[PDB]
Amino acid sequence: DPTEQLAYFPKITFERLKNYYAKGKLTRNYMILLPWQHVNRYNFVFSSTGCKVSLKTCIGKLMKDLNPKVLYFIGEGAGNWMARTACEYPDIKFVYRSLKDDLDHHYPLEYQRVIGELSRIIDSGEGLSMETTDATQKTHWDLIHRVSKDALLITLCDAEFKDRDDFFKMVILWRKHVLSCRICTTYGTDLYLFAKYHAKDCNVKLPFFVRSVATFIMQGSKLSGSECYILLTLGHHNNLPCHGEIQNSKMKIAVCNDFYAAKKLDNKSIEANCKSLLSGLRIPINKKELNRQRRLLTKWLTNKANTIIDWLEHILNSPKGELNYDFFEALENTYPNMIKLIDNLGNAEIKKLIKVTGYMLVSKK
Ligand SMILES: [Zn+2]
């Protein structure tokens, strides 16, 4: 059942800034190296965007008002955001698109493991070329209605654009489509595009007839970043959110709010992330379990293994704290040779380490 499965997803905290004087800067230098935003994502293996952003939480009223039958997703991932959306709205259907590559993801692996069946996905994107899956290409939009004949009411883009102009290329193409499309023009100018954007400069105008409604700053976003989500529509264009706006809102959420843990614990997922971090790791991860992984080793792979145990060992010895960057900074600055950890382990393994670290801290006391 979709609604029962929603309990494995964590509560989202965000800041909404409607686009419709001197506001001093909020600053706090957190001495953190690890990606602590994955601390409440222990229940998800491949993708985990559903823990970062949600439609019922952010655009809940817009979902109720527009009441779409089909939701369009252009996110280059395993479909965890789409998986959460299926749990929130169990009668909604989906059109899925992701850039076709062997390097990255181009199939809903996470949606399939969360929901079970792909029956609700009416357009998996199968049989499409590399450019017909690329949001920055015309032919991608020309083939979006190949199955779904419903208007693009709410289009959701989680694409991570290499170039900042590539975001614009995608936006201009969305505008061109909604103002041309026989289906979409019948629905009117009350069409939306909710997309991930990296705020870098100030007073940067959006393309012609593209108006920003609100800007959402997520707790789940990388602290050191400037990633936000912007709701866009047809109307007299305004400027994109500036780098300053985001940092202050981002800081408040980091300084004040705590990371909410998931109501339920998917043991299958936790077992999977544990074996993916260190093959042989079993739950619960106690002192006896960690001493077993040490004796098993008695080489680069054996050096990488020891680094992992030593960190998980530090978590066991560390007291239970509130899930906030102040406590994560403490955890980091109390563990000696933190630089050895960052040097030995790659970006994916370091994300896997924090998912398991999070499981531990939640399982404490
Ligand atoms: Zn259309």
Numbering used by the authors: 1617 to 1636, 1642 to 1919, 1939 to 2005
Q: Which sentences from the paper describe this structure?
A:
Most notably, hMPV and flaviviruses share an unusually long (∼10 residues), flexible β2λ (that is, the loop immediately following the β2-strand), which forms the SAM-binding pocket (SAMP) along with loops β1λ and β4λ, shielding it from the solvent. In CR-VI+, β2λ similarly assumes alternate conformations. Loops β1λ and β4λ also show a degree of flexibility. β1λ residue E1697, conserved in paramyxo- and filoviruses, forms a hydrogen bond with the NH2 group of SAM and is essential for both MTase activities. However, in the absence of SAM, its side chain either moves into the sub-pocket that normally accommodates the NH2 group, or, more markedly, turns towards the solvent in the direction of β2λ, which in this case assumes the ‘open’ position. β4λ forms a side wall of SAMP, and together with αD and β5 also defines a deep, hydrophobic cavity not present in other MTases, termed NSP (or nucleoside-binding pocket).
The Mononegavirales order groups five families of monopartite, negative-strand RNA viruses many of which are highly pathogenic and/or contagious; the Filoviridae (of which Ebola virus is a representative), the Bornaviridae (Borna disease virus), the Nyamiviridae (midway virus), the Rhabdoviridae (rabies, vesicular stomatitis virus (VSV)) and the Paramyxoviridae (measles virus, human metapneumovirus (hMPV)). These viruses encode a large RNA polymerase (L) (usually >2,000 amino acids) that is crucial to viral replication. As a part of this study, we expressed CR-VI+, a 406-residue fragment comprising CR-VI and the adjoining ‘+ domain’, the variable region carrying the K-K-G-motif, investigated its MTase activity and solved its crystal structure. Besides sequentially methylating the 2′O and N7 atoms of small capped RNAs, CR-VI+ also 2′O methylates uncapped substrates and displays nucleotide triphosphatase (NTPase) activity. Both the CR-VI domain, which assumes a fairly standard MTase fold, and the K-K-G motif of the (mainly helical) +domain are required for the MTase reactions.
